[PDB]
Design a protein around this nucleic acid. Structure first.
Ligand SMILES: [K+]
Ligand SMILES: [K+]
Ligand SMILES: [K+]
Ligand SMILES: [K+]
Ligand SMILES: [K+]
Ligand SMILES: [K+]
Ligand SMILES: [K+]
Ligand SMILES: [K+]
Ligand SMILES: [K+]
Ligand SMILES: [K+]
Ligand SMILES: [K+]
Ligand SMILES: [K+]
Ligand SMILES: [K+]
Ligand SMILES: [K+]
Ligand SMILES: [K+]
Ligand SMILES: [K+]
Ligand SMILES: [K+]
Ligand SMILES: [K+]
Ligand SMILES: [K+]
Ligand SMILES: [Mg+2]
Ligand SMILES: [Mg+2]
Ligand SMILES: [Mg+2]
Ligand SMILES: [Mg+2]
Ligand SMILES: [Mg+2]
Ligand SMILES: [Mg+2]
Ligand SMILES: [Mg+2]
Ligand SMILES: [Mg+2]
Ligand SMILES: [Mg+2]
Ligand SMILES: [Mg+2]
Ligand SMILES: [Mg+2]
Ligand SMILES: [Mg+2]
Ligand SMILES: [Mg+2]
Ligand SMILES: [Mg+2]
Ligand SMILES: [Mg+2]
Ligand SMILES: [Mg+2]
Ligand SMILES: [Mg+2]
Ligand SMILES: [Mg+2]
Ligand SMILES: [Mg+2]
Ligand SMILES: [Mg+2]
Ligand SMILES: [Mg+2]
Ligand SMILES: [Mg+2]
Ligand SMILES: [Mg+2]
Ligand SMILES: [Mg+2]
Ligand SMILES: [Mg+2]
Ligand SMILES: [Mg+2]
Ligand SMILES: [Zn+2]
Lengths: 74, 134, 48, 57
RNA sequence: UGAUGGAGGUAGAGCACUGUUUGGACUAGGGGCCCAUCUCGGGUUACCGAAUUCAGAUAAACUCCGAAUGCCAUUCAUUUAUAUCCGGGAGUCAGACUGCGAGUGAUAAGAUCCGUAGUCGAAAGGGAAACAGCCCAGACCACCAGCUAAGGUCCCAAAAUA
RNA sequence: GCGGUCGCCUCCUAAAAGGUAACGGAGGCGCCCAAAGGUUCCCUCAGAAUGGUUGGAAAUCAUUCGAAGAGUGUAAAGGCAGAAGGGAGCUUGACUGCGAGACCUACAAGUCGAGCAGGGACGAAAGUCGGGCUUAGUGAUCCGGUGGUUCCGCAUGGAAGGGCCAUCGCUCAACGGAUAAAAGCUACCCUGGGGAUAACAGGCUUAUCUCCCCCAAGAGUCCACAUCGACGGGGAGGUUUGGCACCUCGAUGUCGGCUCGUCGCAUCCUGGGGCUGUAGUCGGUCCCAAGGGUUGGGCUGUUCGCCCAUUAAAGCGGCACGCG
RNA sequence: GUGGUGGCGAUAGCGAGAAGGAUACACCUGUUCCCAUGCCGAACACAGAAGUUAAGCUUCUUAGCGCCGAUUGUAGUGAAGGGUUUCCCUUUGUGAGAGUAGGACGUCGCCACG
C-alpha cells in the first residue's frame, strides 16, 4: 500500500551569489557534496556548506564538472 | 505484443503534443504508413493491422512494426466508486504522435503495398497516409 | 543484544558518560579512557 | 528623451505584476497619462504592459 | 522595470547510463534429428537463440545535454511608496468557476486533488437572448452633454441594406 | 459500513529556488558497529580475454584490457576512485563547559555551526577528531527508579521530604500522548442538526448498455457485401449496470396494479417500394411511413418470464422507472 | 635543453609512430646498514654507480578516438491574442538538444642545472 512520504527537507541554496553574509551563515543544504566548499567555507556533518568568515558569497565551477562556493571578505 | 517486463506496474497516461520525436521517416521498408494525428494505439489494434497487411500480401515480402506498446493503462470495474488507489493494469498502448511511421513493408509491388497499408489504416484509430522510402 | 550502558569514573565513582554496547560482542564490562569533568582529567571509566 | 504614456486599457483581470507596473509608472484611472524619461528601465516597464498603454515621444 | 551574478535539471531534446524495444549480420549455447555412441565425434533445420556489432525507437520514478520563465542577491540604475517591528480589536479554517500545468477518473463529469492567474465570494454597469464564476469594465453624487472598451450597425433594437 | 491508513526516512507526482494535495505511483524505519569510530600511513575496483591439478559457467593463481559498469552495514535519492571504497599501526574526540552566526519553523521542537576554554587520541609537522558518505533507527508533560549534589530543611540541631545535575521506566505505534483504569445491542427508541452526506426521482458524464455505422478475413457449391460478418475502428441515444453528489432531509411518497391517457420512431400489423441465394405460396433484408390498431386467461405482490387460447398484429420507449 | 613546482574546463587527454640521455630523470647493482613484505629488497627503505635508451621519461609527427565548437534552421517557451479548444494556430521576445563549418596533439608562470 502506498500513501507514505517524508517531510521535505528544504534543501538547496540559502544565499545568493554576490550577497554579503556573516560568519557561520548556511550557504547550501544538500545530501552529499553536490557543491564543494571553497575558500573560507566549511562543510557540516550533513554536507551543509557554511561561511567561516564574513564576506560576499561566490559560486564558481571547480574544474570541468564540479561546482564550488567561496566567501570573500571585503 | 506485451513487454516481457516493466520497471513500474502502473504509469501515467501522459500527454501527446507535437510531432513524433523520431522515426518519422521510412527506415527499412520501401513503403510506410504515417500517422497524421496523435492517438493511443493498443496492442490489439497493432495486431489487427499486422494481420490485415500480411494476409493481403500473402505472407510475402517483409513487414516492420515500428511502434511498440510500452505504456500500460489501467481501469476500474463497473460499480466501483472513485478512490481506493489506482486501478489494476488492463491493457497496453503505444502513444503515437503525428508523423510517426507505424508500419513499413517491402518486397512487394507498389499496388499491393498501397492496398495492404490501406487495409491496416482502416483497422487503426488514427488517420494515416502512405509514404515511400526516400 | 544491544543495550544502553553507563560509564562511571573509577576514581570518583561519578556516572559521567552514556553509551551502548552489544552484550554478545562485548560480554565483559566496557572500559575506556574518558575525561572526568569533576576531576577535570582523563581517567578510567568502567561500565556498571 | 521623454515618453508620454497613457493608460488605454483597464487593469481589472490582469496579473499583479502588470498592475504593479502600472502603479510604479504612476498611472491611475484609465486614460490617465504621465511623462517619464526614456530609460531602459522605463522602456522595459512599457514593454511589460505594452498591451495596456500607448506611448508617444 | 532594466543591468549584472548566481542556484536548479522542468519543457524540449538525446541514447552517454538504467529499464522497455524493432529489424539486419554473426554466433556461443539450447532444441530436434541422423550416423556413431564411450552420448558420444560429427552434418542439418534458413527451429529458439545469449553476448557483440549495424541500423531504428521509447520513458513520471532514464539523462551525455538542456531552455523560456520563475527564484535568490546587488550600499547598482529609473519610477513608485510602501516595507519591518511593538501593541489593541477581529473575522476566516464549507469555497465556486474560467484559462493554463499535473495527478485520480475512462486523457468522462457542472467529477475529484494540487500548482498557477483571474473573476465571483464581497461587484453594480455594458456584451454573451435569459445566464454568480466567461468578455469589457470597478457605481461618492447631478445633467434631456461628448469620446470610447467588449460587442455590434436589415426590423424587433441604438448604429453601414458601408 | 467492510477493507486500508495514523509517527519518521527516500524517490516520482512537484509544473529546472523553496514549498505544494489525493483512500496518487513506489520503497524503507522503531536498528547496527567496541569497529563498521578517530587519527597516521598505505592501497584501488566489477567484469572480460588468455593460460593454468583437483576445478566443473563459476573456488584460488598469473598477464593484459578495463573510469567505475564495483563497493559504500541497512530503502531510495544525492555523493564518493584526490576517496566517503579497502588494509594495517596506535587509540577512544562515540570528549567536558559552551557557542558568534545561520537554516527550518504557528508553538513545542528540529538542523548546521566556525570559534573559545579544559584535558586528550593520532601524526615529525601541518593539522584532523564533539561518532559512522549524507538524510530514518523515535515519544511532551505528570509520576516513579538510580547516582551525584558547598541547594532547602516550617522554633533550633537533625530527620523526613523536596530542589538542582545525570540517567532509566512508553508498540502512550490512534506515535502533540483524554483516564492509573473501560466492550456491546436498540426494529421499543428519543433530541439537536445536515440536502455540508447516502437511499427515490431530477441534473452532469456515457465507461457499460441499446441502436446505427466504417474496413472486409471468412461463411454463403463459385461469389466479402441475397443473407451472416471475425480481428479491429467511428458515432448517436439517455430506456440498463454504473460514476459524481448539484436541488430537495423546518419531508420532492417509494414497486406493481387500476382510471386516464399523451408523446418519440430505432415500425409489431396495416400502406408504398428496392434487392434477393425473389419460380408460385411463403419469405429474408433494407428504404419511406407514427393515420389507426396493437388481447383474454393459469402461476406468481410482482416487473419480467413460462404456459394456455386467440389475433392482421399481440411494437419498443419517454412523460418524477407519467398518473396515491 | 633538461629536472623540479604550479595556474588555467582534455583546445592540456587517449591512440599510433619517430628521435635522446651531454647533464638531468630513469631504469640498473646489492641488502651491511635504519626500514619492509598479512610470502617475496617486486614494493617500501637504505648503500652504489657495471650497462641501456630497451621501457618509463622529454621532444617531435599524426585529427583515428575523446575534447571544444560558431552561424542558420527547428522543437520548446515568457507576454499579447485566436480557433472547429485532449489539441492547434497567430503576433512579439527568447531559444535549445541534435547536426554541422571549424578549432585543437596546449598555453600562462617560478626555480636549479645548461
Ligand atoms: K483509421
Ligand atoms: K523526465
Ligand atoms: K484552478
Ligand atoms: K584504523
Ligand atoms: K488519538
Ligand atoms: K425487534
Ligand atoms: K420519483
Ligand atoms: K455515447
Ligand atoms: K450511425
Ligand atoms: K455473389
Ligand atoms: K429529503
Ligand atoms: K405509453
Ligand atoms: K420486401
Ligand atoms: K402509425
Ligand atoms: K393474475
Ligand atoms: K394514497
Ligand atoms: K633494486
Ligand atoms: K626510453
Ligand atoms: K589532442
Ligand atoms: Mg522528500
Ligand atoms: Mg554525523
Ligand atoms: Mg519529455
Ligand atoms: Mg467542482
Ligand atoms: Mg460566505
Ligand atoms: Mg456583474
Ligand atoms: Mg447574489
Ligand atoms: Mg470607485
Ligand atoms: Mg462615437
Ligand atoms: Mg435602427
Ligand atoms: Mg517551480
Ligand atoms: Mg522544486
Ligand atoms: Mg564506511
Ligand atoms: Mg527544623
Ligand atoms: Mg496525532
Ligand atoms: Mg420484533
Ligand atoms: Mg429528529
Ligand atoms: Mg449537495
Ligand atoms: Mg426534483
Ligand atoms: Mg465537491
Ligand atoms: Mg417547507
Ligand atoms: Mg424511419
Ligand atoms: Mg382457479
Ligand atoms: Mg412512477
Ligand atoms: Mg399526485
Ligand atoms: Mg548546441
Ligand atoms: Zn572522576
Amino acid at each position: 500500500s502506498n500513501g507514505r512520504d517524508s517531510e521535505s527537507k528544504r534543501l538547496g541554496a540559502k544565499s545568493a551569489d554576490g550577497q554579503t553574509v556573516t560568519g557561520g551563515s548556511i550557504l547550501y543544504r544538500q545530501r552529499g557534496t553536490k557543491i564543494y566548499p571553497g575558500v573560507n567555507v566549511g562543510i557540516g556533518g550533513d554536507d551543509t556548506l557554511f561561511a567561516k568568515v564574513d564576506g560576499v558569497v561566490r559560486f564558481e565551477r571547480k574544474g570541468r564538472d564540479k561546482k564550488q562556493v567561496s566567501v570573500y571578505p571585503v | 505484443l506485451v513487454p516481457k517486463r516493466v520497471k513500474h506496474r502502473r504509469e501515467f497516461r501522459g500527454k501527446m503534443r507535437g510531432e513524433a520525436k523520431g522515426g518519422k521517416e521510412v527506415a527499412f521498408g520501401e513503403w510506410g504508413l504515417q500517422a497524421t494525428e496523435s492517438h493511443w494505439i493498443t496492442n490489439r489494434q497493432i495486431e489487427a493491422a499486422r494481420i490485415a497487411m500480411t494476409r493481403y500480401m500473402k505472407r510475402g515480402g517483409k513487414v516492420w512494426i515500428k511502434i511498440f506498446p510500452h505504456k500500460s493503462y489501467t481501469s476500474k470495474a463497473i460499480g466501483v466508486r472513485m478512490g481506493k488507489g489506482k486501478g489494476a493494469p488492463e491493457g497496453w498502448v503505444s502513444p503515437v504522435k503525428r508523423g510517426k511511421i507505424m508500419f513499413e513493408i517491402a518486397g512487394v509491388p507498389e499496388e499491393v503495398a498501397r492496398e495492404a497499408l490501406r487495409l491496416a489504416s482502416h483497422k487503426l484509430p488514427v488517420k494515416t497516409k502512405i509514404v515511400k522510402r526516400e | 543484544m544491544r543495550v544502553n550502558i553507563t560509564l562511571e569514573c573509577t576514581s570518583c565513582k561519578e556516572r559521567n558518560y552514556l553509551t551502548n554496547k552489544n552484550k554478545r560482542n562485548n560480554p565483559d564490562r566496557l572500559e575506556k579512557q574518558k575525561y572526568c569533568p569533576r576531576e577535570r582529567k582523563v581517567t578510567l571509566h568502567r561500565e556498571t | 528623451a521623454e515618453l508620454k504614456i497613457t493608460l488605454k486599457r483597464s487593469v481589472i483581470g490582469r496579473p499583479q505584476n502588470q498592475r504593479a507596473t502600472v502603479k510604479a509608472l504612476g498611472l491611475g484611472k484609465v486614460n490617465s497619462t504621465v511623462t517619464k524619461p526614456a530609460n531602459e528601465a522605463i522602456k522595459g516597464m512599457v514593454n511589460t504592459i505594452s498591451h495596456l498603454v500607448d506611448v508617444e515621444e
